[PDB]
Amino acid sequence: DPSLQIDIPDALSERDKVKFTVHTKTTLPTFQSPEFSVTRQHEDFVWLHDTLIETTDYAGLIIPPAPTKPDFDGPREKMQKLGEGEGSMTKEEFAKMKQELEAEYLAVFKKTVSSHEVFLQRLSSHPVLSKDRNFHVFLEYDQPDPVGYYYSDGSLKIV
Amino acid sequence: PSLQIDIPDALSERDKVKFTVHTKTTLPTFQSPEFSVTRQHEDFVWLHDTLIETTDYAGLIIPPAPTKPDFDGPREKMQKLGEGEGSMTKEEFAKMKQELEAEYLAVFKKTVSSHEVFLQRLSSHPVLSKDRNFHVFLEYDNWDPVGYYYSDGSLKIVP
Ligand SMILES: [Cl-]
User: Fold this and answer.
1) Which residues pair with A19 in a beta bridge?
2) Distance CA B34, CA B24 (A)
3) Spatial CA neighbour of B19 closest among B106, B118, B101, B102
4) Would you call A150 and B11 a contact, using CB atoms and an 8 Å cutoff?
């Protein structure tokens, strides 16, 4: 489906509130531009799903489930038991334990990014919902400094 | 395959680059088989100088230091563009910010490869690969980190 291609290439979590980058590649004329990105929070996805669910014309349609709210609590307080407890172990078994707790944080971050992304892709596939204008507002409504840049795999990304 | 080094990503805050130095190893010397650290250009310079002034490596081939990352050309163009935002159309501010970002990206790609080739050359060298100062550079680990930045299946700390 060249028509509408959506991905979440990156995300930021500060204090376990997540800001997702929603990147759209489309050939459909409804959109102002062929490629664009916006930053979204979980409430935006909930609004999108609930708006589709409450549309009368989509009664009985297959509406892909909403992504679950991001939850970092399991890793977060595990991190605060260890993190502020250096003197409890060796310098190297503090380091070891700090890495796998961050590995736990990564597992949660990856799955919630995939959870929010799969939702957007399923909408893209749907012949009715993919043309929904509330979906389109979710993809492109935009606009709130070159301080910081992240380089990976030959690509530049802003903070 | 024993000792494998790459720089998967890097972060530039105020044009100071923090490189992700990623190590995949099966050798018993390292506390972990695969691990990653953040290094800055001064750390690479220190390693090169330590090797040069090491007596046991006197006649060896020492790979040149990576060039210091230089973003000045794009940076000043960027600071001017930033000051004329309110002076031009939003469509021509987008165009020029895209061109300066591509210019910034070219410098970023070239200095990341400059730093990575140095590490891989050290890696490949039969003597130098096994120097513990190099091991300190690969394995050794100022504020709290704000949150976590997710991209490419990886976590990066944001300060
Ligand atoms: Cl905020």
Assistant:
1) A12
2) 4
3) B118
4) yes
How many Å lie between the centroid of ligand 1 and the Cα of residue A80? 23
Q: Are A12 and B148 a contacting pair at CB < 8 A?
A: yes
User: What are A21's strand-pairing partners?
Assistant: A39
Tokens in use for B45?
């310079």
Residue A159 alpha carbon to ligand 1 centre in Å? 13
Q: How many CB atoms lie within 10 A of CB A127?
A: 7
Q: Which two tokens stand for residue A83?
A: 């993190």
Method: X-ray
Domain coordinates in residue numbering, chain B: 3-158
What residue type is assigned to position B119 of the chain?
L
β partners of residue A40: A20
Identity of the residue numbered B150 = Y
Superfamily of domain B3-158 in CATH is Phox-like domain (3.30.1520.10)
What's the CATH code, domain A4-158? 3.30.1520.10
Documented resolution in Å:
2.5
Check the annotation: does B132 bind a ligand.
no
Q: How many CA atoms lie within 13 A of B5 on its CB side?
A: 24
Distance CA(B143)–CA(B30), nearest Å, equals 27
- Cβ(A14)–Cβ(B158) under 8 Å? yes
